[PDB]
Amino acid sequence: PYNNLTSRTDAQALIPEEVSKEMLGKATEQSAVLQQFRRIPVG
Amino acid sequence: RNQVRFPVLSALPVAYWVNGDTGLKQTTEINWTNKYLNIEEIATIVPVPDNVLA
């Protein structure tokens, strides 16, 4: 026995994942009509 | 969270003698694998007339 090299897959189960979210989410346009048209109140 | 993963052993090391003050030392692996546990509902519902509880 002089070739018992421990591989990555032999140890793989011990390695945790990691996750990150800095690219999650998106911009929003405000509605055109409420931007442009003249507001009036109503009851 | 909804499921859990456990690591566990799957192969064991061993060890060896040496001839005198100088001889080749040997080598061994250690290996691991995974087990999972899943989660499920148990639930029950009971009705009563409102006045009875008062």
Task: Return the SS3 of A42.
Answer: coil
Contact B6, B35 (CB under 8 A): yes
Query: How far B41 CA lies from chain A's nearest CA (Å)?
Result: 27
| B36: nearest Cα among A19, A8, A13, A17 | A13
Contact B4, B35 (CB under 8 A): no
Task: Return the SS3 of A10.
Answer: helix
- Choose, out of A2, A4, A7, A17, the residue to mutate when testing the contact with B (most B CBs < 10 Å): A4
Contact B26, A1 (CB under 8 A): yes
Q: Is A6 on the interface with B (CB under 8 A)?
A: yes
Cβ contacts of A12 on chain B, cutoff 8 Å? 32
